[PDB]
Amino acid sequence: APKAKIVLVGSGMIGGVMATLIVQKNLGDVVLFDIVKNMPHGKALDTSHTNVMAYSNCKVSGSNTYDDLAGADVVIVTAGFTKAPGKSDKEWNRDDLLPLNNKIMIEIGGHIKKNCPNAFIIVVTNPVDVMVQLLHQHSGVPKNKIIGLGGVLDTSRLKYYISQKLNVCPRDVNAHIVGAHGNKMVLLKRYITVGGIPLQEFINNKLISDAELEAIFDRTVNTALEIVNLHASPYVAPAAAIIEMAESYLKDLKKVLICSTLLEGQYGHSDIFGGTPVVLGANGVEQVIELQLNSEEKAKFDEAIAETKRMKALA
Amino acid sequence: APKAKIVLVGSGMIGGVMATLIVQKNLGDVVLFDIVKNMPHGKALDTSHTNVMAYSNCKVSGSNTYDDLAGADVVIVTAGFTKAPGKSDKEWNRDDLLPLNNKIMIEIGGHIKKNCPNAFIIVVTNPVDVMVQLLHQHSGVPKNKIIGLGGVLDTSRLKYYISQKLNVCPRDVNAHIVGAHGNKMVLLKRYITVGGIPLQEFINNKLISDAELEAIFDRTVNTALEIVNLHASPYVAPAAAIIEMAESYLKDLKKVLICSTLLEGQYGHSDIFGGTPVVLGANGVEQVIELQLNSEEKAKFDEAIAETKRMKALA
Amino acid sequence: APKAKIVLVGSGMIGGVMATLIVQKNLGDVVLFDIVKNMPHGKALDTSHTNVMAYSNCKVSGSNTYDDLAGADVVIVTAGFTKAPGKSDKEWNRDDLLPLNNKIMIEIGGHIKKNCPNAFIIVVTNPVDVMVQLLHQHSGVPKNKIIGLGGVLDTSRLKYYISQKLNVCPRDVNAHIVGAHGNKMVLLKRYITVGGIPLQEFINNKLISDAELEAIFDRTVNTALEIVNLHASPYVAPAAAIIEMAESYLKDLKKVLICSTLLEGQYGHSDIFGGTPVVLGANGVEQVIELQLNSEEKAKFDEAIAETKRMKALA
Amino acid sequence: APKAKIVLVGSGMIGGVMATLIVQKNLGDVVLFDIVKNMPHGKALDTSHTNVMAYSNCKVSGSNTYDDLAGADVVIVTAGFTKAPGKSDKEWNRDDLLPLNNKIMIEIGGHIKKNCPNAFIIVVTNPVDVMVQLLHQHSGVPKNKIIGLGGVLDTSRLKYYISQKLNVCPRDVNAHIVGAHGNKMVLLKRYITVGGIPLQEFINNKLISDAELEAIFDRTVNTALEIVNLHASPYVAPAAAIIEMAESYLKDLKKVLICSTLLEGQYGHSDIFGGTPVVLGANGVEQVIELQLNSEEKAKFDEAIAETKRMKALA
Numbered sequence A, B, C, D: 001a002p003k004a005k006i007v008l009v010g011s012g013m014i015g016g017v018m019a020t021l022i023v024q025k026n027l028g029d030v031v032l033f034d035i036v037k038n039m040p041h042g043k044a045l046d047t048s049h050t051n052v053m054a055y056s057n058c059k060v061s062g063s064n065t066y067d068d069l070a071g072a073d074v075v076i077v078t079a080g081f082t083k084a085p086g087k088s089d090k091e092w093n094r095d096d097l098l099p100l101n102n103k104i105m106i107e108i109g110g111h112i113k114k115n116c117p118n119a120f121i122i123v124v125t126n127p128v129d130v131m132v133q134l135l136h137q138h139s140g141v142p143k144n145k146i147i148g149l150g151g152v153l154d155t156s157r158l159k160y161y162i163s164q165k166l167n168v169c170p171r172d173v174n175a176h177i178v179g180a181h182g183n184k185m186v187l188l189k190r191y192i193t194v195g196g197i198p199l200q201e202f203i204n205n206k207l208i209s210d211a212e213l214e215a216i217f218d219r220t221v222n223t224a225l226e227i228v229n230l231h232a233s234p235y236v237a238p239a240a241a242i243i244e245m246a247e248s249y250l251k252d253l254k255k256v257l258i259c260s261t262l263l264e265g266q267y268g269h270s271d272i273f274g275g276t277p278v279v280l281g282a283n284g285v286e287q288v289i290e291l292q293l294n295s296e297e298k299a300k301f302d303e304a305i306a307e308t309k310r311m312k313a314l315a
């Protein structure tokens, strides 16, 4: 009334799952945009039939034409590479995607600025905390209208693994991972709860040990690498996390979700994007929540931001 | 496969909303049982038509026959009075329902024992922490198969009021209210989080004050009384809370939900029911979670239990 | 984005269920407006807490102030009486509500015209086909922006009863009831299908007989009277039907739903509202579908319209 | 209570989407079984994290071990090839998959018979009407406990394309495609409705022409080939169709869904599987609905069955 138009800039693995989920949730019309000929049209056609099964009414079209960004309410950018040429799966590292994906963000930014400067933008392309700022710079959109995927996905993994040990509903575990989406992501032990209860109570009761949690933390950090080596760069959970973010915007849910956003002094950092809880509603990023980190937690945050900064200089 | 059978023992205000929600969620077949002639049949007929609008397939029938408890998978007991004769709305107090509702619990307990001893039982009738134990005693069901409504409802109010001030999604506020469902309910300030973050951070940031929270606590405790004086004994949110509990059981969600359950030493209390977080799944109460209360919080818990104990002696 | 504002003009039995369902479906902010003091505020407060259980974010407020119609995207009018003074339940007839409810529609129409002339209006108050046109006249809204409840509800009953006999999913039965919502509602036997198959195939196979269908038709026509005599004027299924209609508008689903709408020559009738399939989407009534009735079916349609016309002259 | 166990025998493109949708809908625990090492474990891990985003509690595990079929409530067989070696995309034909997939069905059948003879089986592997009977023969399961995917998917395409022309909600178009899932699928023009109304009324009103419908029929038959040539063998809509079928079984919805099932005289055919409306509920195929085809429609049905029969002799 009128339906949202959601343009998926990138129609690869994450793009495909997002289109599926958008139709399931009847969230809006979908454009699967890609530079690859034919493929987005095929995925769009396949996906469009699910309107019947889902009792939805969302158009799904493919596109190779950047001007289809015109009219977009939400733009989700997954365009780019998941691996660097010559690198084995064992040495997979998001940092190595920087020289492959940087020029793509600049190009897409220019098209967003021309065609849909008032759209809400979600950047996914890795290394995401670098790429989101690059796209912010070139798209010209306001700081409250662009975020990067990271924390919703990283914490989904931490929350899930803890829930398996404790035999509780996965979403009843809450947790914070901040700073950057990469190997220096900051897993804040102090900010884990189970049914709203400090995780430390469960540790005290010997229901999960500190050593078990350490292993879960390592597993969380290395989850993408683990999945890359088993199969592929992850896509199902990334897509679900992105759609949770987009839905909070579209429906004005005002969920607290950890995303990469422009810092303007929070944690002692400015002029850079980093992962922190934000509130997503109809006005985009309605609030940037600054966790009251202690000095040791802040030092870990600084290590994460330093990686983003290092790569930004290489970009 | 086969569909759950859910018997609503009591087809009044809460019963009606529960039947509506069960059909919306396609949770199982419903029996609206009541002692009142004709009424449950009328409500059942009205409600049954919503299967079409909801794309569900749940039978909804009315009953005046206790033997319809046979085959029940879940029994929800709302049977009883919401007010005592002669009392004004201003002096409404759940304690005064004790002499009206006690004999009803005994009667229903006998029918559950005969007809559906393996059912999962949710007791709602006030004063609920007294009534749930009375029904436990007379139904003979295992301790893991019977709970009382309280904390999900009480905390829904606290969570909601805080969310309104902070402009976040209501369910992103988490909170614990324990001990008893009544005027001595224990609102645990230390156990409030917003997006998994200690509420104290928001207080420190002057986004909500300690004085504002005090007023919200008072409002939470007095919410039922407020609604009684505006309209009626509450029913929509009670129904939704009950269905959240029943659904966690039926679908094995293993949600952490605060309910009245048999204490066997937790908080220093035995041989009594009280409100505490529990995990609800396919095996009923799968875990009783004991909050690691400090001495001052425990003293408040003791005050709540003392009220339940006092009335149990009067019953 | 921004959330729809849905004003329920009338906060009685149907109003209450609608508010509940709106929060369940997260459809928009809700105002429960009524002339009765305190009651709508109490219902609103109770209902608002269900945002937590439902993972929704819809405001629910009560109102006695007509100016709260300002800003409404959807207005649902249930204001008025369900029974006439002095009449027994056995002689309940929607026609007798005419002198009670006519002035109410005029009053509400004036307030809609002043405060929300661009809102989409759903009229429920009986006798609905008369009341909807009266409100159209006094509100001044376009013909595509106002409909009356009838056919979705009447057919939910027919569809449901047939589904019970045939042991199929209720919504897999499709059926048309047209003309007017009252005792001369036209049940079109030729337009019944089961899984898209003509009902006649099932009759031929002796899975349901013509005599059984006749009894189901009578039951359908007399369903409201049946429920009135068992309990009350129906409210759960009416609410669900209304919300199905409102949702199709709000989400641009373009569902085909039978509603009372202004006829401009369809079926040989003009200058009157009657029940017919329409398509509801973002532009309101996007299409009025005229069934290609045979002469005998049309004669029944004429009998229904004649009742609406007779009462319009009395109004 | 206890959760269903759903084993996906085949963890390729359709398997992946099914696992995603099962978690979205919280339908049961999932095993992604495949002969490929590592891949199913990677997909399972990725998918499992979506329990958090979806508020679900479904295990998702990978497997290379056939014995994990033990305990299965539902088994969905997508194992096998989507294309034949040496064939271009332009000459893609499901018939050519016969020599590649036949031995796979026999092998899987033996493992089902040993490990989960009481499971409900959905066969997807092409050519599906041949493969489903082969699996029936080797698994030994009852005729009411095994179906093949076809008609839900084929009709989703027809329904969708018509809905686009008529600007109505996709699922408000109903249609039947019977006989076989392949190039001789029978598109029954007489059995198309829109909002329960004969499509012929819309043709009479010049809202869609007979020539337009002919083009839509051709498009429907050739949809898989179209998607193969644009992208890949279809997977998103196949997955959604399969999950609609599985869900109707698991939740006892009793939906009418067109599937491949054992014919025992319907349409004059026995000892073969073919596509026809069936009712899916807790007892599996609860009803086989025989459309009362006219002689010309039956001749088309016979042509479809003849293809299945021809390939069965080659198998």
Ligand SMILES: NC(=O)c1ccc[n+]([C@@H]2O[C@H](COP(=O)([O-])OP(=O)(O)OC[C@H]3O[C@@H](n4cnc5c(N)ncnc54)[C@H](O)[C@@H]3O)[C@@H](O)[C@H]2O)c1
Residues within 6 Å of the ligand: A009, A010, A011, A012, A013, A014, A015, A033, A034, A035, A036, A078, A079, A080, A081, A082, A097, A101, A104, A107, A123, A124, A125, A126, A128, A148, A149, A150, A153, A181, A233, A234, A235, A238
């Ligand atoms: N931030 C996160 O939490 C997170 C998580 C997972 C993956 N990722 C990243 O997301 C990105 C996409 O992952 P995927 O699995 O979907 O990859 P993919 O390779 O399957 O899809 C990427 C698509 O981008 C397309 N593309 C390239 N240039 C384009 C352009 N200019 N415009 C439109 N499309 C273009 C490619 O043709 C391809 O189809 C990768 O960079 C990956 O590393 C980020």
Ligand SMILES: NC(=O)c1ccc[n+]([C@@H]2O[C@H](COP(=O)([O-])OP(=O)(O)OC[C@H]3O[C@@H](n4cnc5c(N)ncnc54)[C@H](O)[C@@H]3O)[C@@H](O)[C@H]2O)c1
Residues within 6 Å of the ligand: B009, B010, B011, B012, B013, B014, B015, B033, B034, B035, B036, B078, B079, B080, B081, B082, B097, B101, B104, B107, B123, B124, B125, B126, B128, B148, B149, B150, B153, B181, B233, B234, B235, B238
């Ligand atoms: N625990 C909680 O958080 C909570 C919250 C709200 C209300 N309540 C309590 O729930 C109860 C029901 O509230 P309501 O608003 O639905 O009340 P209600 O008066 O509308 O309905 C109660 C129904 O119980 C019926 N009844 C009486 N004896 C019966 C019997 N032996 N078997 C079956 N039915 C019988 C009555 O006829 C009536 O229809 C009250 O006791 C109320 O105080 C508890």
Ligand SMILES: NC(=O)c1ccc[n+]([C@@H]2O[C@H](COP(=O)([O-])OP(=O)(O)OC[C@H]3O[C@@H](n4cnc5c(N)ncnc54)[C@H](O)[C@@H]3O)[C@@H](O)[C@H]2O)c1
Residues within 6 Å of the ligand: C009, C010, C011, C012, C013, C014, C015, C033, C034, C035, C036, C078, C079, C080, C081, C082, C097, C101, C104, C107, C123, C124, C125, C126, C128, C148, C149, C150, C153, C181, C233, C234, C235, C238
């Ligand atoms: N069209 C249909 O299919 C259909 C179906 C069922 C009921 N109905 C009709 O819907 C109407 C409402 O039914 P209900 O069960 O909700 O009745 P109800 O008596 O419970 O509620 C009606 C409410 O309207 C209020 N009211 C009176 N004047 C008002 C005004 N000027 N502004 C706002 N509110 C006002 C009353 O105070 C009352 O709370 C009745 O007329 C009933 O006959 C229509």
Ligand SMILES: NC(=O)c1ccc[n+]([C@@H]2O[C@H](COP(=O)([O-])OP(=O)(O)OC[C@H]3O[C@@H](n4cnc5c(N)ncnc54)[C@H](O)[C@@H]3O)[C@@H](O)[C@H]2O)c1
Residues within 6 Å of the ligand: D009, D010, D011, D012, D013, D014, D015, D033, D034, D035, D036, D078, D079, D080, D081, D082, D097, D101, D104, D107, D123, D124, D125, D126, D128, D148, D149, D150, D153, D181, D233, D234, D235, D238
């Ligand atoms: N009936 C229908 O309407 C319909 C529609 C679309 C596709 N299909 C068919 O479904 C099948 C699967 O399609 P897809 O897109 O998922 O193909 P896919 O190639 O992506 O996946 C098939 C999987 O089967 C696996 N496999 C092979 N042998 C196996 C065995 N013995 N046990 C377990 N797994 C085994 C492969 O390793 C592969 O991962 C194909 O035969 C396709 O033609 C049917």
Ligand SMILES: O=C([O-])C(=O)[O-]
Residues within 6 Å of the ligand: A094, A126, A153, A224, A233, A234, A235, A238
């Ligand atoms: O960035 C990624 O690839 C991830 O974490 O899924």
Ligand SMILES: O=C([O-])C(=O)[O-]
Residues within 6 Å of the ligand: B094, B126, B153, B224, B233, B234, B235, B238
């Ligand atoms: O017990 C009650 O009445 C309540 O809190 O709603």
Ligand SMILES: O=C([O-])C(=O)[O-]
Residues within 6 Å of the ligand: C094, C126, C153, C224, C233, C234, C235, C238
């Ligand atoms: O109009 C009514 O009262 C009904 O049909 O529910």
Ligand SMILES: O=C([O-])C(=O)[O-]
Residues within 6 Å of the ligand: D094, D126, D153, D224, D233, D234, D235, D238
């Ligand atoms: O069988 C197929 O490949 C299809 O129709 O999607």
